[PDB]
């Protein structure tokens, strides 16, 4: 019944600007105060800004006082977050949320509907395609059990990459680790499989890396 679709986020360099838009459905903005809350990667939640469209009253966190501007447009039943002079500590998923207005309540309460968040990345990195190296089965396997092998996917930007093994023909035992931002602003990631050591000789293992935001497509054979 109630909906909150956010949009307008993405990738931007420090100093740059962005406009988030939280389109609401099923309720009127004038019966609500709207809020932006952010979740930096791996960290908790934090409140950015709020607005009450019925009155125009607005409020901001201190870290973003003077750079961000919340605003509403009730004819489009939509709220906006204008973000200027972005630093890298503004990188986060940005969730808008609603608190319903109740004429008997005397003050605002919890955030009772949330939208699914947009991602905002503030890096100086420039979109680059990944380099694929093989992670070879050891030339010392225990002789009669399982082996491990994989693909190393290094130096790509931005996320996400997607890995598959033998073009999807191999899913059992596949682990693709979450990507890691190295000390150079680029991402790195590994994907590994366990297979029987017997199959090492007479089964060829090829992983398929695909990075969309740079239209890259690799295919690496893994072999002793």
């Amino acid at each position: 019944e109630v909906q909150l679709v956010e949009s307008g986020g993405g990738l931007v360099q420090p100093g740059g600007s962005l406009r988030l838009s939280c389109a609401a459905s099923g309720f009127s903005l004038s019966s609500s105060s709207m809020h932006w809350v952010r979740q930096a990667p791996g960290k908790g939640l934090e409140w950015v800004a709020s607005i009450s469209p019925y009155s125009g009253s607005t409020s901001y966190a201190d870290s973003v006082k003077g750079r961000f501007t919340i605003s509403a447009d009730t004819s489009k039943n939509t709220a906006y977050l204008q973000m200027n002079s972005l630093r890298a500590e503004d990188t986060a998923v940005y969730y808008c949320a609603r608190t319903k207005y109740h004429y008997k309540n005397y003050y605002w309460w919890a955030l009772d509907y949330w939208g699914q968040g947009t991602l905002v990345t503030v890096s100086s990195a420039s979109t680059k395609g990944p380099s694929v190296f093989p992670l070879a089965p050891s030339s010392k396997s225990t002789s009669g059990g399982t082996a491990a092998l994989g693909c190393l996917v290094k130096d790509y930007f931005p996320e996400p990459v997607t890995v598959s093994w033998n073009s999807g023909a191999l899913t059992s035992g596949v682990h693709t680790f979450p990507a890691v931002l190295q000390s150079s602003g680029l991402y790195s990631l590994s994907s590994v499989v366990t297979v029987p050591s017997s199959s090492l000789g007479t089964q060829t293992y090829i992983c398929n890396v695909n990075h969309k935001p740079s239209n890259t497509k690799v295919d690496k054979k893994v072999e002793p």
Binding site: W47, A110, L111, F133, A136, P178, S190
Partner: protein, 212 residues
């Protein structure tokens, strides 16, 4: 002063059927102006409790909250499969609103030792001028493992990074990767590279090495 919300524990393991409690202390009194939220990975928070103990509509009655001074408790009477997620408290007695870091509610299972695998850098990478040494810890539990890198018996710091899967969809284990990145110059100055793993399921450390 911002009223801060401090949440413990950071995580915990339980099983379907368990009674589960999470707590959150406020830097100072917030009277009853605490709410509790549920969030599943990469998905929106949902509101469970407001006014420290009121059940927001549609929130299954298994959820309860209570107050003890500046201590706030969220309790799942009998734990369902849907309820493993991260839980956050929030205090709105004084603007600005503020959140605790969250309690992550993980699946309990038995201890499993990691199978450890070590991978030298590829000749391809070695030409580009860098060397990545990967060390893999497969299907272990609980999450707390330690991977110490030893280069010629010398212990390393600052030059590696770890990533860990979420709990496996079928057996609820973890897998972990640690990559020790060097420059090509440094990799060939040395001879023996070792990964040393310590975990509950391992009575003594598991070391795996190679030379070149």
């Amino acid at each position: 002063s911002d009223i801060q919300m401090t949440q413990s524990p950071s995580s915990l393991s339980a099983s379907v059927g368990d009674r589960v409690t999470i707590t959150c202390r406020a830097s100072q009194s917030v009277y009853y102006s605490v709410a509790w939220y549920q969030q599943k990975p990469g998905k929106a928070p949902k509101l469970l409790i407001y006014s420290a103990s009121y059940l927001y509509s549609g929130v299954p009655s298994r959820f309860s909250g209570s107050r003890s001074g500046t201590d706030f408790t969220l309790t799942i009477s009998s734990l369902q499969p849907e309820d493993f997620a991260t839980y956050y408290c929030q205090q709105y007695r004084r603007r600005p609103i503020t959140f605790g870091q969250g309690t992550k509610v993980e699946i309990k299972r038995t201890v499993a030792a990691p199978s450890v695998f070590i991978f030298p850098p590829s000749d391809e990478q070695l030409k580009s001028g860098t060397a990545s040494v990967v060390c893999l810890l497969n299907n272990f539990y609980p999450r707390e493992a330690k991977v110490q890198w030893k280069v010629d018996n010398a212990l390393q710091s600052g030059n590696s990074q770890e990533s860990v899967t979420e709990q496996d969809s079928k057996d609820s284990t973890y897998s972990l990767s640690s990559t020790l990145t060097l420059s090509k110059a440094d990799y060939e100055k040395h001879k023996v590279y070792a990964c040393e793993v310590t975990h509950q399921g391992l009575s003594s450390p598991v070391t795996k090495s190679f030379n070149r």
